[PDB]
Structures are given as C-alpha cells and as structure tokens.
C-alpha cells in the first residue's frame, strides 16, 4: 500500500503542533509530542508526562504507520497520493472507527470522490464546532481535491 | 502602519522550512534549528549541538518574522495585496534582507512591474536545487493569486 508523504506529514504536524510535556487537547484527552495520546506500547498519555524530540518522533511514526494501515485496508478505490495524505490526516484526528463508520468512506468506496471530499467538512466538532477543526477539514479537503 | 504575515504566509514558510529541535546543517553550511532559525533574537548564531523547545522555536520564528516584515514594509514602495506580502516575506526569510533589497525583483516591483517581479521570484533557486524551485514556484503562485 501507500505511505504518508512529506506533504501529508507536514500537514499533520502543522495542525497537531509538537509539545514535550503532556497537555489537555481541549476535549479531555491528554496529548504529547505531535498529537500522541497513546504510546506504542498501549500506555495512555497522562498529565505530567514528558518526552524528548526522538521519543515524539518515534510515537508519531508508530501512529502514522497505524493510520496508514487503516486507510490502505479501508479504501477500495484508487487514490492519489494527495488523497491518501488527506485521509491519513483525517483518520489521525478522528480515529479508525470513525473513518470506517463514516458516510465519507461509504461515498469514497462507491467511487464518489466529490461526495467524500465534501464529507470531510462534517468532522469539525468538539462534542461545539471549533474553528481549528473547520480550517483543518478545509485544508484536508483542498489537498484531497488537488490534482 | 504596514502589513504583518498572515496565517497563509506563516503556513507556507513553516511548511517549507520545517521545524526541528536539534541544530542541523541546512546544506550550504549554515547551522539551523527551530523553524529555519539561524540567528537567535539576541544575535547569537545557531551552532552545532544546540537544542530548543517548541515554545522557543515559536519565539525565534516570531522574532524573525517581525524582522522580515519590516524589511518588506520599508523596502517596497508599491501597493501590495496580503498574498504578495506573504510571498515576499517567505522569499526574504529564505534569502535575506540584503539579497532582496539588491534584487532586480525589488527594482521591477517598485517600478510597478508586478508580473516581472513575480517571474523574478524564480531565479532564487540556487545554493540549482529542486526544493528551492518548488518553494519559489509556490511563492510566485501565491504572489500572483488574487
């Protein structure tokens, strides 16, 4: 299958940010590194955790491989590298279950690229529509549609 | 009052520079850290072995952004769109204030020849390298976007 490109890694990194002490992501999930919330050994990120640049790099790479596998195994239609990057970013933010259950994936796997691109935009909620999620879904949709 | 870099320009610059927390050689022998930082705000040059935190990289990036915004605001005598200001700030961040001020790009720009300056973006691709080509093309396209 495919792997995330430098473009997709940079998109994800830019929207996740990088921090080396654990912080609450706003919805109550403690986060560290570049958006890490679960360490590769299954341990949850908790308040007071600290990490080094190399450790954040390792956690980011592990989770990238995980969501790359999710996308490669869930999507049954051809993808450009742009679309794969966008879908990996989305799934990184929303999770594998949310992707697999989304109408986005239903439309995508019916071959309805435009419908899936537009379905990117419905994932802007904090449980509140946050603006950062709005901008992120818009940027991901734009990458997904870029040829 | 002049312009400041917008989220679009910040995203462009950060995306092409990347962010790193150990000092690295940028390929031409200039040690670099954070988001393209090579000179700390107190004048100290980035040197091999230096480390920084995300917050420190952010502070250094903001300082250098303000510096190059001034260079652009004080060097360009023609009206600019926000797109053009962002593109020029990205370019000047990469090449420096002296190179910009002496460039034929700026001469054409300040004569009111926007198209010529946009095209002059493309000659700043040398140590001729490819990432620089892609960056100059993205900056030129932003510069021409309405």
Numbering used by the authors:
A (entry chain A): 37 to 163, 165 to 184
B (entry chain B): 36 to 162, 166 to 184
Question: What did the authors write?
Answer:
Structural prediction analysis showed that PHAb10 contains a putative lysozyme catalytic domain (amino acids 1–110, P10-Lys) and a C-terminal cationic peptide (amino acids 111–149, P10-CP), whereas PHAb11 contains an N-terminal cationic peptide with unknown function (amino acids 1–36, P11-NP), followed by a putative lysozyme catalytic domain (amino acids 37–145, P11-Lys, with 68.5% sequence similarity with P10-Lys) and a C-terminal cationic peptide (amino acids 146–184, P11-CP, which shows 94.9% sequence similarity with P10-CP). Results showed that PHAb8 was a monomer, while PHAb10 and PHAb11 formed an asymmetric dimer. Each PHAb11 monomer contained an independent substrate-binding cavity around its catalytic triad. Notably, the N-terminal 36 amino acids, P11-NP, were missing in our PHAb11 dimer. We speculated that it may be destroyed during crystal formation. Structure-based homology analysis revealed that PHAb10 and PHAb11 probably belonged to the T4 lysozyme family and possessed the conserved Glu-Asp-Thr catalytic triad shared by traditional phage lysins and bacterial autolysins, namely Glu17, Asp26, and Thr32 of PHAb10, and Glu52, Asp61, and Thr67 of PHAb11. Our results showed that PHAb8, PHAb10, and PHAb11 were denatured with transition temperatures of 41.4°C, 53.7°C, and 59.9°C, respectively. Interestingly, signs of aggregation were only observed in PHAb8 but not in PHAb10 and PHAb11, indicating that PHAb10 and PHAb11 underwent structural refolding without precipitation during heat treatment. Similar to the folding-refolding phenomenon of PHAb10, PHAb11 and its N-terminal peptide-deleted variant P11-C could restore to their native conformation after 1 hr treatment at 100°C, while its C-terminal peptide-deleted variant P11-N could not refold to its native conformation, indicating that C-terminal peptide was essential for its hyper-thermostability.
To understand the catalytic mechanism and thermal stability of these peptidoglycan hydrolases, we attempted to decipher their structures and eventually obtained the crystal structures of PHAb8, PHAb10, and PHAb11 by X-ray crystallography. All these observations together indicated that PHAb8, PHAb10, and PHAb11 were highly evolutionarily related to T4 lysozyme and might share similar catalytic mechanisms of action.
